[model samples]
Target: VSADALHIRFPDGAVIEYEPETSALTVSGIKTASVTASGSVTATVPVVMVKASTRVTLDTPEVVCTNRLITGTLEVQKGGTMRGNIEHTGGELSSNGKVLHTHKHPGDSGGTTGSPL
Candidate 1:
């Protein structure tokens, strides 16, 4: 299942929109499907399929459970405008690589120059 419109509103009257990539949230609400992530049970609810171009508005300071069970892997490729503080919980967050910088260059003189005779 796919949804074209997904809105998230924060407590401070901020709003964000996203488009989820996977069906983790939709399948988690199914009765037959046991949703799990990171080897743990996250949700046992009936799965509801959300079609493309579906519009959903969420209230602020709310937790939108994409994969309720948290037992399996949940991959989300969401995008849109956002306002307020966004955070991730109960899991590890990381980046593939980082950039490093240097202060000085090689073969450079460090002392001041004086007038030659």
Candidate 2:
């Protein structure tokens, strides 16, 4: 599926083109964009390592484990329906977009939870 003007960007000035289910992306870097599933259900996007104030933007219909206790600032802009989880610790979040349900997490107040917060 593809959005009209919405696009997902990567580190090397790359935009993830929607090839209609042939390009399942799994990245480990400062890659920022929208995410998803289908090629593999129960896909886990782990916040593998904690960096010194790292920021990433991921938007997808399905994802798991957005934060693994990393203290930093992150922004989000989802281009689809969010159906997963996002957590944070010892930091703050702020955004200018909307998606899914908004739940009250510990330090994630004043922000959102679902729909790629």
Candidate 3:
């Protein structure tokens, strides 16, 4: 059972290697990687966490929550809806890198518009 490769050779001569060399593990062929869990799965670490590659897909059916600051352009696309008070932080709202405000219009026939509260 415990040999150089810790090898589990199937009847077809296909092998699943545990502790393959100083590396982790290996299989004779490529297969779809997945974990089928009947209960909740949780992973906790002290500081850094990383998921390598360009995209991640989560098949969660319910809520995702965050308690602290999240930076970057948070986008909502497709059919999913986001419902909550979207408090715009940092007190600045701009369009195309320019600060935006409704300007008071002055005219002879129109009275002067007051400043925004």
Candidate 4:
């Protein structure tokens, strides 16, 4: 006999159900999914990704990122403080025709140096 829905219950009284009509798998609840274990839990998948169409909130004590964290645009609404040396890997920093870190001032040992090469 073909099954309309699939339900799997764990030993700790947690249920995982799959609805074929909507093609959605829900764990323990309708929209929220949670997991609790005494020991460590690991996923052996090659790629793991999390996506939210609306918003995502992370409530944690501390987070440690060892790799690079990249984003399109960053905005700080509240207190903003950054402690790190800014390094430009592209071209030099400049405004008009004068370049920073290599720009020379006039009326000294140098008089109106040309743009940095």
lDDT, candidates in the order shown: 0.47, 0.49, 0.62, 0.72
Query: lDDT tens string, model 2, 68-94?
Result: 534345345655454568554453444
TM-score of 1: 0.18
Q: lDDT (0-100) at residue 4 of candidate 1?
A: 79
Query: Which segments of model 4 are wrong by more than 4 Å?
Result: 1-30, 38-41, 77-85, 88-117
Error of 2 at 13 (Å): 19
Better of 3 and 4 by lDDT: 4
Between candidates 1 and 2, name the one with more favorable lDDT.
2
**Model 4 lDDT, residue 45, Cα:** 69
Better of 2 and 3 by TM-score: 3
- Provide the global lDDT of candidate 2 against the true structure: 0.49
- The clash count for each model shown is 16, 1, 0, 0
Each model's RMSD to truth, in Å?
19.5, 19.1, 6.6, 8.3
Query: Which candidate comes out best when scored by lDDT?
Result: 4
Model 1 stretches with alpha carbons more than 4 Å out: 1-45, 52-54, 64-117
TM-score of 2: 0.18
- Candidate 1, residue 100: Cα displacement in angstroms equals 8.9
Q: Give lDDT tens digits, candidate 4, residues 16-93.
A: 898998997777734566789998778886766778798777667645566777777666566546578967655667
User: Between 1 and 3, whose TM-score is larger?
Assistant: 3
Number of the top-ranking candidate, with TM-score as the measure: 3
What would the TM-scores of all predictions be?
A: 0.18, 0.18, 0.43, 0.40
lDDT of 1 at 26: 23
